[PDB]
Amino acid sequence: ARPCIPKSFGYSSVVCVCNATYCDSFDPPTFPALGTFSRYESTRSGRRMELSMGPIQANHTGTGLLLTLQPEQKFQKVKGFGGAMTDAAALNILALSPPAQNLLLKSYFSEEGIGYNIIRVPMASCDFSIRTYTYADTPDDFQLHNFSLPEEDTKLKIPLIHRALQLAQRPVSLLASPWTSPTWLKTNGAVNGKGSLKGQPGDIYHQTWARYFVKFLDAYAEHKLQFWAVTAENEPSAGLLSGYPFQCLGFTPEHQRDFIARDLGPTLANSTHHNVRLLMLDDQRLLLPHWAKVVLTDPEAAKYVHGIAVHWYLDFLAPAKATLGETHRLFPNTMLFASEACVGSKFWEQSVRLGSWDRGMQYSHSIITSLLYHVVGWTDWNLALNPEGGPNWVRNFVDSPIIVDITKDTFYKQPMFYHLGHFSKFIPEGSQRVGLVASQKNDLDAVALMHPDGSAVVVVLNRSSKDVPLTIKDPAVGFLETISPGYSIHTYLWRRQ
Amino acid sequence: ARPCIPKSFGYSSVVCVCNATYCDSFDPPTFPALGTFSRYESTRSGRRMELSMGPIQANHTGTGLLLTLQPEQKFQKVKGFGGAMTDAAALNILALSPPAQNLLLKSYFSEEGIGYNIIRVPMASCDFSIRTYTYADTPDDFQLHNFSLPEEDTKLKIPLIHRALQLAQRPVSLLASPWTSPTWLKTNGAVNGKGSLKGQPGDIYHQTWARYFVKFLDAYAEHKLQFWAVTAENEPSAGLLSGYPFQCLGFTPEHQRDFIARDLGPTLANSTHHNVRLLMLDDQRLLLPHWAKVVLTDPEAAKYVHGIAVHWYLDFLAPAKATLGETHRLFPNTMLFASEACVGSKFWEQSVRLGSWDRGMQYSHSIITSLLYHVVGWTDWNLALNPEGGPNWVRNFVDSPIIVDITKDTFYKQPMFYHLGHFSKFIPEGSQRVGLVASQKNDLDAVALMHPDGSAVVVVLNRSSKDVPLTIKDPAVGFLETISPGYSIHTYLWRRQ
């Protein structure tokens, strides 16, 4: 059905404008007959996940580039794709009119949209809030007698979360992360700055802080919301930097280890929420594999940890092999998950670049790397922001896939939206990455996965200006003959029986 | 931080086993928000000052005994709690390896322990010594030229006291008492038995005895230890009984009165230790009020007496009102202080009974009675003894809160120890006893006090076998709903503001 309404703000590409009565959308999903493939296409010239279809050849002649499926090379299973429901996202979303809201939520969550199946939920306030608060601000309330969710949860995040689950077809998983504990638990008595939990693991402070996870899970359950997972802390490495500007709680990897084994693990275990998974680290790539070595080589800690959450700041480099690769090699059965990614945080960049194709490519380039290095899921940061990249109470603005202009009851889906979508719409939970080898050096980024039902998906990104002819060989069925346009992203889907 | 390792020895309760690398201990104190109380419980079944918390609510759901705090009804202020560093006690402590020694001292003195702030130091030898001696055994040395401290003081008592002071949570006060003088001052030329100072007050025997107090004080000051008080004599009435087998020095109350007036008072006052307080009596409670009347109705004596020290022999009965009550009534500006308590002389009982609960109850009961009869401090006898209840050069008659087992480098903390701790750990110097009103006749023993900073502490002892439902009201906070289990002791603490 409805095509993209393009508009340009002077960047390398266009945004798709949506409002109360209109938004681009897909027809209900279809599978091509055996012997044919589907192609979805997004180009910098302005194509937006366009659907075409072509035949699979029995034979192939040539000297051009060949990508070969290796359906026997089985690698990680995929958890999913999605984003974060911050105070800022919720607040921009709910500022729109109600039909525009429905369409924004449809874009992300519906099958007419891009099929997100993960939502990350901050436990209380972070920098993408308009104010600082915890769930237990009453001083010294060790018993958590005055614990409670404010309006940010009850009138913004939770109503929106229910609306997303209602709209989605895939089961959605929710992931929680705290930025700061209440201040009376912290060495410096502030939400920001350098400090950690007072005393040491096993004690009253650390036990209270774990009880607070449970009170959080209890509160959300009273609103009929269950979590798949919690992280042990958002960016623990931050609470160790003096003058750190926004909400935080610092743990050395040793402190995180000890916290997990003495308090958080056991407390989660002895409760009605014991099925909730715990992920550690929830920090940048370069903290790996050191942090994993420290936490996972202690079996009292390890037994509690399901997986490792990593952040991906797209404007910064990190060698994937020395970080994810090595971590996987050391701990093959502890899943790697990407719990937050963003762009536009470097000191010299604009937060928001409406229509930026460059930033689209940065997302997809980096998601393919993730999958080539064992990552099982990928979560975006803010689901929506304003044209400043906000609100943010320390003015720490960044870009977002959807940009909301309240004065116009309008939102803009950016290249990032569709670059994410090329993954999230076509790699349901359960899919398994498999091998794919190239027949010669080339400029493409490609990944191949197999769906739970047996059928195939390949994503292809071209970061060169040049058109690249290529053929994908699947020995079950034959050859896909196609072209990858310069600065383009394609997803390919086909049946194998 | 670390829990009690239980061992039973066939009595009604357990002891806590501590050795060179393990001892049960506490976290630093952590004060909960207004409207929350802390509770420490110990039970005969095996709980040992376990911490729990709960609410002070605004509605009253109980229908039983009500105990209402009357914070504006003020009584005595507390000097503190502690025990005696006898030769015996030091021999036992030093029997352990140094790491175990530190655990022993921390148990008593430290914040991670029960926070003693009083140590009684015998002047020379008593029955808990391994030989008889005084600081001046060279005969006819009236100018006390050969006065000096033996190894017992320089190598055992003193270094341990330094070590306790270093560990202590609070400023510690030292109290000294003499058992016997050099026998060349005595009517009987013997360390024990019926015999007092030769001659009469004013003469050279009495002057020399008085100067011995100053020489003692001088010697300990060279080791950088100052005293808070000294008693006029330990158990003066003992020396009047024929055949008294332990070191003694007999004084009739008339003789104590004149000794203070003519000799001990003026000598102390003319000296560099004029600030040391002098306490009279230092003997059993049935000598009161009569001893007070004799000494304190004479003004030449009363001006040097700062308080009356009493002993508690826990195996024996003694009405508090006719003794302590009546004493306070006749001399209400003269502090009462318990300077020695012990239990276990019953010819038919084991001197040390490892894990005896009845014996702890005896300690707490007597402490509560004490506080309710104006007593401002409480000092236990031997800090530590071996398992036969020694070393004692006469005979082993009494228990101690800690029992050292040298051959296993381990020590045992008795119920006694926890029963004292219920008081000592939570009532700092400066605390003041306040009203606590029972709504109806009951089986509990309770006392209430107010910390220097205004917060509340209440101790509640259940000597019966039946559980008692209990409400405690603080007019400025609300109602504390609780149960006092059979054979238990609780201490409650809260903010009032």
Ligand SMILES: *[C@@H]1O[C@H](CO)[C@@H](O[C@@H]2O[C@H](CO)[C@@H](O)[C@H](O)[C@H]2NC(C)=O)[C@H](O)[C@H]1NC(C)=O
């Ligand atoms: C929301 O945007 C839609 C889509 O652009 C707008 O509808 C278009 O508006 C122009 C001007 O009226 C027309 O010439 C197009 O034909 C319209 N297309 C369709 C499919 O309706 C619409 O006006 C916007 N709504 C608001 C309130 O601005």
Ligand SMILES: *[C@@H]1O[C@H](CO)[C@@H](O)[C@H](O)[C@H]1NC(C)=O
């Ligand atoms: C805590 O909660 C209770 C009950 O909801 C309320 O009456 C009380 O005022 C609260 N206390 C504070 C300090 O906010």
